[PDB]
Design a protein around this ligand. Structure first.
Ligand SMILES: O=c1ccn([C@H]2C[C@H](O)[C@@H](COP(=O)(O)NP(=O)(O)OP(=O)(O)O)O2)c(=O)[nH]1
Ligand SMILES: [Cl-]
Ligand SMILES: [Cl-]
Ligand SMILES: [Mg+2]
Ligand SMILES: [Mg+2]
Ligand code: NA
Ligand code: NA
Length: 326
DNA sequence: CCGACAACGCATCAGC
DNA sequence: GCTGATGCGG
DNA sequence: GTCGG
């Protein structure tokens, strides 16, 4: 955070282009700059110095100089004052509400937490739960609580079927001291890229996590991706732990490494590694990495037996989870 | 210049 | 009912 | 908004 001031500015600029401008690319460009500048081991003294880092162009360069001079960005000072932009930005903070639904509500005149509350009949299921746990979801999860949640999830899963393998990924696997949520990659021998010999593999687990009252709500649930809520149990007289977001992804066992790579992130690391991958002539997703013929069509899945194998194909020196926090 | 920008599961809608 | 486009995730 | 060709 040697440049915490600069990277926050870019993030705010990025959330704006995304929520208000619905200009996803500017959003991604800004996040990239914030990212590269964030790992830069020096306290940036000027736009020029920043323009050197890849991802930082001329526009961002000027903003950084202005920011270093005045201590703020005019363009942001204005954005903060515009009521429409502040409403949209706010609503989007509710899980389930994005740029579109956010702008839609404002038109209707629904632009404050009070409004959403007295208009629950105008939200889909996810949005409703996102409203219910509005505060909680804004709270980070201390690694210790993560470790505690991990035990429940792994033990409960072990109970449903000893052959289930549950690995906690996301920022937890990258070793963060706090996480925005808990991410769980789940595999079982019956579900392989070749065949699904057992149905409801994800359902059963979710069902077990519910019986023990660990999982309390469901944002969305399909055969391989579950999006919901959970809560650590509290002791007698102890004030309750906040409700936490939980993501569970069922992946074919033979595709574990591509799956764990992806789910370990970060999102920006994935974006960059996948981008590079293409440049090297490959395509990478949560399931496999494949080659690319001039035509464009992906080829057949290359053999993978470790995360490193994936790094090797693209000719990138392996990077432990802790170093993928971009 | 200017196209490209990672990738995909689920919820929900339009159109048939 | 389906298929496809869009939103959201994030 | 930035980038490589
Ligand atoms: O846009 C995305 C989002 C997530 N992911 C992957 C990487 C990320 O680490 C993982 C889990 O998603 P989260 O949104 O939970 N992010 P993460 O766990 O890294 O951080 P946080 O602590 O905020 O949850 O899914 C992507 O590839 N693209
Ligand atoms: Cl854009
Ligand atoms: Cl695939
Ligand atoms: Mg996470
Ligand atoms: Mg998550
Ligand atoms: Na640059
Ligand atoms: Na939101």
């Amino acid at each position: 955070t040697l440049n915490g001031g600069i990277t926050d500015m870019l993030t705010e600029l990025a959330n704006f282009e995304k929520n208000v401008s619905q200009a996803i690319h500017k959003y991604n460009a800004y996040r990239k700059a914030a990212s590269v500048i964030a790992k830069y081991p020096h306290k940036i003294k000027s736009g020029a110095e920043a323009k050197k880092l890849p991802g930082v162009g001329t526009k961002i360069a000027e903003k950084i100089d202005e920011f270093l001079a005045t201590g703020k960005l005019r363009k942001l000072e204005k954005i903060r004052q515009d009521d429409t932009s502040s409403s949209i930005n706010f609503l989007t903070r509710v899980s389930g509400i994005g740029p579109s639904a956010a702008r839609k509500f404002v038109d209707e005149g629904i632009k404050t937490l009070e409004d959403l509350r007295k208009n629950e009949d105008k939200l889909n299921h996810h949005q409703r739960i996102g409203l219910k746990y509005f505060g909680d979801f804004e709270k980070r999860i201390p690694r210790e609580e993560m470790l505690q949640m991990q035990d429940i999830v792994l033990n409960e899963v072990k109970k449903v079927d000893s052959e289930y393998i549950a690995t906690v990924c996301g920022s937890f696997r990258r070793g963060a001291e706090s996480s925005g949520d808990m991410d769980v990659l789940l595999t079982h021998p019956s579900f392989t890229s070749e065949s699904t010999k057992q149905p409801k593999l994800l359902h059963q687990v979710v069902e077990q996590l519910q019986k023990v009252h660990f999982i309390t709500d469901t944002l969305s649930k399909g055969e391989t991706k579950f999006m919901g809520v959970c809560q650590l149990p509290s002791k007698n007289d102890e004030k309750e732990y906040p409700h936490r977001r939980i993501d569970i992804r069922l992946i074919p066992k033979d595709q574990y490494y591509c799956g764990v790579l992806y789910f370990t992130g970060s999102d920006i690391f994935n974006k960059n590694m996948r981008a590079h991958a293409l440049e090297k002539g490959f395509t990478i997703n949560e399931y496999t990495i494949r080659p690319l013929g001039v035509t464009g069509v992906a080829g057949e899945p290359l053999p993978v037996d470790s995360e490193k194998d994936i790094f090797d194909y693209i000719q990138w020196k392996y990077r432990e989870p802790k170093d993928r926090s971009e």
